[PDB]
Amino acid sequence: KLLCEHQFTIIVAELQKELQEQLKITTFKDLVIRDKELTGALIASLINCYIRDNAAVDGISLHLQDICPLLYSTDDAICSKANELLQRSRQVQNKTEKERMLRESLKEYQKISNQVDLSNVCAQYRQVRFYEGVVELSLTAAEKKDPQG
Amino acid sequence: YKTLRFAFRASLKTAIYRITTTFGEHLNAVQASAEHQKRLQQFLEFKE
Amino acid sequence: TPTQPGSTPRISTMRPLATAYKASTSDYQVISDRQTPKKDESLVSKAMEYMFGW
Amino acid sequence: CSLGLFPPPPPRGQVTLYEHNNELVTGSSYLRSEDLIAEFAQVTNWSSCCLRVFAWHPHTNKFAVALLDDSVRVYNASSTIVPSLKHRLQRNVASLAWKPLSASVLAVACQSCILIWTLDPTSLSTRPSSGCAQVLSHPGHTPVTSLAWAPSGGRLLSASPVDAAIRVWDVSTETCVPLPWFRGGGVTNLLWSPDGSKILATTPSAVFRVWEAQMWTCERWPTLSGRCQTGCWSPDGSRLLFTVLGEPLIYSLSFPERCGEGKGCVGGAKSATIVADLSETTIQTPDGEERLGGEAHSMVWDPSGERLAVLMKGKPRVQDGKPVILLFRTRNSPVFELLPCGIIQGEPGAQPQLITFHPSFNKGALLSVGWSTGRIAHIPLYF
Amino acid sequence: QCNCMMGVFPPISRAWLTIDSDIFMWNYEDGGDLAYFDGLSETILAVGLVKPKAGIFQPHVRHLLVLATPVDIVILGLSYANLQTGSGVLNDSLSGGMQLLPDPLYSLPTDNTYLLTITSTDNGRIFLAGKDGCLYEVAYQAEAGWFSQRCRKINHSKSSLSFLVPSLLQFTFSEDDPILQIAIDNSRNILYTRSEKGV
Amino acid sequence: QLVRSFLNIKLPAPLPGLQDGEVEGHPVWALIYYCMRCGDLLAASQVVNRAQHQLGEFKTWFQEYMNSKDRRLSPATENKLRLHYRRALRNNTDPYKRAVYCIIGRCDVTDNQSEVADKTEDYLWLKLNQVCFDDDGTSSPQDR
Amino acid sequence: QMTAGVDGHSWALSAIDELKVDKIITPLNKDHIPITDSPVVVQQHMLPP
């Protein structure tokens, strides 16, 4: 319903083509019982429209949290907010505000750190010279893998 | 070509009026010299 | 057996179903144009405006 | 639409003061070259009326009035001083036209010339010098009946019923450019569209010609029972209203925009439409019958395009042949509509002699009316 | 004085009644929107609602009313008040007060064939039942083509070569079996008829 | 246009309590307030003209306040606003709708607009617009 | 089977228009959806009396 209302045909055209063709052969009972990549990629495309076309992802993340308690889609929504701030930090030319939005982006990833692609996030920090968040998030991604020592 | 200089004086006054009659009082926000803003007001008030 | 009983006497609430619309529109209620003053497109009148001019 | 949809005229002693809520609120008060001007003048009785022409300045509360003594007077809301204009060539004034994109320039049509008065807008003296009056004329273009400036301020037109050529003037290089057509009549009245791209030209005959201000092309309309008497463009110029002498009809004609290249063609629809009728009707009033209908002598639209004022003249069977002001509410998109508003009435025993709207009134519209008493009224229409 | 016919048109939320020459319509769920039509001078013999063919009439003409008398077949346009193109309103009733056009869109003579029942397809082909055992159709279009009227009546029971049969052989071996009913299958594009004598 | 752009940073989500609606995607009272806080009563007047149909008499009071030199209603309208605010707005769910009234009508010196004034400059600016130099008996001392 | 009494002669008798639920026939289930509609016990949620 949410994908129909956010103009559908747009969000489906943002997908990888291999998923655009899989979408035509997966039945609703396959999408419910068996699939995860089509459902995750449709959420990811909906949010990449918000990030690219520069809406605030908070105003779709909070809607996905009412309608997608599977396992709770709060962590996809936090990762999406952490990513929104990280990709906007690549366009911010105001240094102190880039250092703000990187320490904000970091404090979203520092919640969900057990489930973060730390290699990709820390490489995406190298791509903005944010070596501070590479030390912090990589410790906060060991901190909670072994909380017992 | 003998009278074309009166056409230049006439078309410069129509050209300045053609900008005061689209932007109107938004032209008070336009950064210019104080005597140019004072001249621009004479082309809003229709004194020219 | 008799027919139906009459109402208690009133003043009628009944309206016309056809509205008295004062614009002659039948020839445009179907998607068309038909007749009015018109544009001089013809070759004969254009030849007249080279030869005579009415 | 027709007169058979209008509200009654107000009772035979009330004056219409303004429109508000779409209601008209009332109160108790607020040929030779001479007779060839009288055949085509915008004033319903120009040969006997004290007032020969009225014209607003196209951007400000300044106006010009031509009178039966061939004075032109200038009035302004910020001046108690009234310039009295009279040149040695000024006779039988037929038309007035202020220049757009200027404070300071007025054209006047006379029996033997055009006069372009230059007027010092801060120094409005009671009688300016006869040098402040640039004379324009050409052989055969006499008398001059009508004058029309281009909206962009760089061109002027003039009309003469004797002359099978519209005269375009540049007033600044001082050039004259006849647009000669291959017979039919000469030029009676002239009207630009507001884009400055289209021009209506009427004649003494059952033919009008519309013209293009880009490539100077012509399109021809000869399928009328009488002469085309008057007309008006919509604010976008996409619609042209017109009326014909002997025909009780307001016609409309459309002109779509040039979404396509490579031809100067004026581009009107192949047909007009009929939208409002002015047939010889009755309406019931507290004073008994009134009777209406006749021929539309002048039509003027507001700058907003939401009010059309129509100066009808009755036939000698209807209100003794008096002229009457009808007011329509108008719409220009998506459909074109002529809804009634009502009937505008003046001082008891007056006749309406001329109508025109104000070009820059920041509260709906403002209708100037010139009366047979020699009075001028200004009736606001609030929207 | 002489005739009465009463019926329902569900797809407009209105019932209908005729009295001699005249027709009356109201909403069947309340007794409301009672409205009549007087544009006749001959007895109504049949009534029918029609779903219009697209691209012929203007978009306010959502339905047509069809009437038939001893002499003519009258076609009128039906429209609805003040249904503005907004959103955020629920599906509550056809209370946009119903209106006929005062211009008949078309008229078409009977040939003196009394007509008794009228119907149409979901594609706007109008079918009429004649007393002469005949099915008829109204074939209509927007313009007048060089060899085709804007509107006309057609007969589907009288075979195209029937003008070669002397009528003295018809008036000796035919006996009026009126078509009292037409039924239409828009799900298979089939048409059915039933007569008085149950053919 | 600067203030409408700044609201994409200060109000990146709609706050549940704001009143009288939106202009161009942003709240009417926030668009009035930040135009006033940056001194542009002409930019604030654009909002007050755009939202006239909700603002009602606030447009006529704002236009009285725009036509003194000194950011003043007459005592004959400032005390209309005091007698409106102390009945309808002191306990409102929109704090921009409080702050703009507390300024324009010099009322509730006992409110600091702490949901709208971010800094010590904004306390200074609030109280400095609330200042009088004048001795009307009509000015009740809890507003003076 | 059921009966009811009617006051006067039945001058007319009609149904009112069916709501019908469109069958989402896709490249997959096109051979598996009945052309006929289900009986009312199968549709008595989505369809009113």
Vertex F53: Cα angle to F51 and F56 (nearest 5): 95
Helix, coil or strand: residue D326: strand
CB D352 within 8 A of CB D311: yes
Q: Which residues are D378's β-sheet partners?
A: D368
The closest of D2, D89, D7, D90 to D53, measured between CA atoms, is D90
Dihedral, CA atoms, D193, D194, D198, D204, nearest 10 degrees?
Answer: 20
Contact map slice: D 132-191 vs B, CB within 8 A: 152-154, 170-174
Q: How do beta strands D146-149 and D156-159 pair?
A: antiparallel
User: Which residue from B minimizes the CA distance to D61?
Assistant: B46
CB count in 10 Å sphere of residue E46: 19
Tokens representing A99? 């250092």
Helix, coil or strand: residue B15: helix
The Cα F30–Cα F116 span in angstroms is: 9
**Count of alpha carbons within 13 angstroms of residue A30, beta-carbon side:** 9
Tokens representing F128? 């400095």
CB D119 within 8 A of CB D86: no
Chain G residues lying within 8 Å of A25, measured CB to CB? 28
Helix, coil or strand: residue A114: helix
Backbone φ, ψ for residue B18 (5° rounding): -65, -15
For D223-261, b where at least 16 C-beta lie within 10 A, e where not — what string?
A: ebeebbbbbbbbbebbbbbbbbeebbbbbbbebeeeeee
The Cα E23–Cα E33 span in angstroms is: 14
The closest of D81, D51, D49, D237 to D151, measured between CA atoms, is D237
The closest of D299, D321, D318, D322 to D310, measured between CA atoms, is D299
The Cα F42–Cα F32 span in angstroms is: 10
Contact B14 D102 (CB under 8 A): yes
Backbone φ, ψ for residue C45 (5° rounding): -65, -40
User: Which residue from D minimizes the CA distance to C37?
Assistant: D223
CB E37 within 8 A of CB E46: no
CB D169 within 8 A of CB D158: yes
Chain E residues lying within 8 Å of C35, measured CB to CB? none
The Cα D57–Cα D102 span in angstroms is: 9
The Cα D211–Cα D199 span in angstroms is: 5
Tokens representing A144? 């909670």
The angle that helices A118-126 and A74-89 make with each other, rounded to 10 degrees, is 20
Question: Which amino acid, residue E47?
Answer: V
CB count in 10 Å sphere of residue E91: 4
Instruction: Dihedral sign for Cα E54, E57, E58, E61, please.
Output: negative
User: Which residue from C minimizes the CA distance to E59?
Assistant: C29
Rg of the Cα atoms in chain A = 17
Question: Which amino acid, residue A114?
Answer: N
For E151-162, b where at least 16 C-beta lie within 10 A, e where not — what string?
A: bebebeebeeee
CB D190 within 8 A of CB D179: no
Does residue F16 belong to the interface with chain A, where contact is any CB pair within 8 Å? no
The Cα D106–Cα D115 span in angstroms is: 8
Q: Using alpha carbons, list the distances in angstroms from residue A44 to A49, A62, G20.
A: 9, 15, 36
Backbone φ, ψ for residue E114 (5° rounding): -60, 130
The Cα E65–Cα E180 span in angstroms is: 20
Q: Which residues are E8's β-sheet partners?
A: E15
Q: Report chain F's terminal Cα–Cα distance, integer Å.
A: 35
CB D105 within 8 A of CB D96: no
Find where tokens 């010279």 sit: A129
CB A65 within 8 A of CB A72: yes
Q: Report chain A's terminal Cα–Cα distance, integer Å.
A: 46
Q: Where are the alpha helices (DSSP H) in A25-73?
A: 28-33, 37-52, 58-67
- Neighbors of chain F by Cβ distance (3+ pairs < 8 Å): A
Chain A residues lying within 8 Å of F12, measured CB to CB? 56, 58
Q: What share of chain D is helix, strand, coil (3-state, %, to 5)?
A: 5, 45, 55
The Cα D299–Cα D312 span in angstroms is: 9
Elucidated via: cryo-EM
Contact G11 E8 (CB under 8 A): no
The Cα F81–Cα F67 span in angstroms is: 17
- Neighbors of chain A by Cβ distance (3+ pairs < 8 Å): F, G
Contact E37 C18 (CB under 8 A): yes
The Cα D325–Cα D355 span in angstroms is: 8
Contact C33 D4 (CB under 8 A): no
Cβ-nearest to C39 among D181, D219, D273: D219
Tokens representing D78? 């910020």
The Cα A147–Cα B2 span in angstroms is: 95
CB B1 within 8 A of CB B8: no
Q: What is the DSSP string of F72-132?
A: ---HHHHHHHHHHHHHHTTT-S-HHHHHHHHHHTT--TT---TTT--SHHHHHHHHHHH--
Q: How do beta strands E151-155 and E135-140 pair?
A: antiparallel
Rg of the Cα atoms in chain G = 17
Does residue E144 belong to the interface with chain C, where contact is any CB pair within 8 Å? no
CA distance E137 to chain C (A): 20
Chain C contact probe: residue of D6, D181, D207, D223 with most C CBs at under 10 A:
D223
Dihedral, CA atoms, A98, A101, A105, A107, nearest 10 degrees?
Answer: 120
CB A137 within 8 A of CB A108: no
Contact D2 C22 (CB under 8 A): yes
The Cα E157–Cα E162 span in angstroms is: 10
The Cα B20–Cα B14 span in angstroms is: 10
Does residue A70 belong to the interface with chain G, where contact is any CB pair within 8 Å? no
Dihedral, CA atoms, F108, F113, F119, F121, nearest 10 degrees?
Answer: -40
Does residue A94 belong to the interface with chain F, where contact is any CB pair within 8 Å? no
For A18-51, b where at least 16 C-beta lie within 10 A, e where not — what string?
A: ebeebeeebeeeeeeeebeebeebbbbbbbbbbb
CB count in 10 Å sphere of residue A13: 10
The Cα A99–Cα A92 span in angstroms is: 10
Backbone φ, ψ for residue D157 (5° rounding): -105, 155
Q: What is the DSSP string of F31-84?
A: HHHHHHHTT-HHHHHHHHHHTHHHHTHHHHHHHHHTSSTTS---HHHHHHHHHH
The Cα D106–Cα D97 span in angstroms is: 6
Q: Using alpha carbons, list the distances in angstroms from residue F55 to C22, E190, F45, F74.
A: 41, 63, 12, 20
CB D358 within 8 A of CB D301: no
Indicate the burial class of D116 (C-beta count within 10 angstroms; 0-12, 13-18, 19 or more): buried
List Cβ neighbours of D47 (8 Å cut-off, separation of 6 or more): D34, D35, D38, D41
CB D231 within 8 A of CB D215: no
Q: What is the DSSP string of C1-43?
A: ---PPPPPP-----EESB----S--HHHHBS----SSB----H
The Cα E67–Cα E138 span in angstroms is: 12
Helix, coil or strand: residue A126: helix
Dihedral, CA atoms, C32, C37, C38, C43, nearest 10 degrees?
Answer: 130
Backbone φ, ψ for residue C34 (5° rounding): -130, -75
List Cβ neighbours of F11 (8 Å cut-off, separation of 6 or more): F26, F27, F30
CB count in 10 Å sphere of residue E150: 15
Order across the sheet with D323-331: list the strands: D294-301, D307-314, D323-331, D337-344
A52: left (phi over 0), alpha (psi -120 to 50) or beta: alpha
The Cα D240–Cα D221 span in angstroms is: 13
Chain D residues lying within 8 Å of C35, measured CB to CB? 271
The Cα F100–Cα F33 span in angstroms is: 6
Helix, coil or strand: residue E119: strand
Order across the sheet with D273-277: list the strands: D228-233, D239-244, D249-254, D273-277
Rg of the Cα atoms in chain F = 15
- Neighbors of chain D by Cβ distance (3+ pairs < 8 Å): B, C
What resolution does the deposited structure have, in angstroms? 12.0
The Cα E53–Cα D192 span in angstroms is: 43
CB count in 10 Å sphere of residue D218: 17
Where are the strands (E) in D124-184, listed by range? 133-136, 146-149, 156-159, 165-170, 175-180
Q: Report chain D's terminal Cα–Cα distance, integer Å.
A: 22
The Cα D240–Cα C5 span in angstroms is: 61
Contact map slice: A 38-77 vs F, CB within 8 A: 56, 58-59
Q: How do beta strands C15-16 and E35-37 pair?
A: parallel
